[PDB]
Amino acid sequence: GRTNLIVNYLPQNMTQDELRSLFSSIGEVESAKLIRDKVAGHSLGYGFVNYVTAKDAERAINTLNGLRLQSKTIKVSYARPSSEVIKDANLYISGLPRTMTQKDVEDMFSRFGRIINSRVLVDQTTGLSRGVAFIRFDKRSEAEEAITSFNGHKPPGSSEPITVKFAA
RNA sequence: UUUUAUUUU
């Protein structure tokens, strides 16, 4: 069974030692790593926790996924095997009709492959979608297929062409 | 252009 977890949405000032200690409450941790920028040294707000046992990893997901830490809500999920293929697979999308929900956006992009995570940005003044979304695919080839299919194109029921590009 | 930050040799 799987033992290795990726932990996203860590507080900016959380240390590797703090990550390890937090997750050690569940069971015996084989290793924990906080990912930091190579050039300047700041946390990138995500890390990996590898448990000795698969039951502990599973319990950690059920217990700690969604845990509030400072102003963050952490995500705890199984890490996919580390590989070049999974990197840079994150899309920025704009021009979406404001009536599209997160699920609607996911429904629209799911044909291209497995979706890792997604977000539709909301205007906090009005509560309405900004028509801007993020969608990360399992593999960069999947995101590329989405770009070529959708970028510059109007969704059915909308007169507005959308932009689909790699995020950043 | 995200809860700025999803693969650590």
The structural domains of chain A, ordered by start, are: 5-75 (3.30.70.330), 91-168 (3.30.70.330)
String of DSSP letters for A51-104: ESSHHHHHHHHHHHTT-EETTEE-EEEEPPPP-GGGSS-EEEEE---TT--HHH
Residues by CB within 7 A of strand B: list them: A 4, 6, 8-9, 12, 33, 35, 37-38, 42-46, 48, 71-75, 77, 79-83, 86-90, 92, 116-117, 119, 121-122, 132, 134, 136, 165, 167-168
Return the H-helix or E-strand segment holding A108.
helix A102-109
Give SS3 for A158: coil
- Note the resolution in Å, 1 decimal: 2.0
CA-nearest of A43, A26, A15 to A5 is A26
Nucleotide with C1' nearest the A79 CA: B7
Nearest-angstrom CA–CA distance, A137 and A108: 13
Å separating the CA of residue A159 from the C1' of nucleotide B4: 31
Alpha-carbon torsion (A29, A10, A94, A99), positive or negative: positive
DSSP tag of A38: T
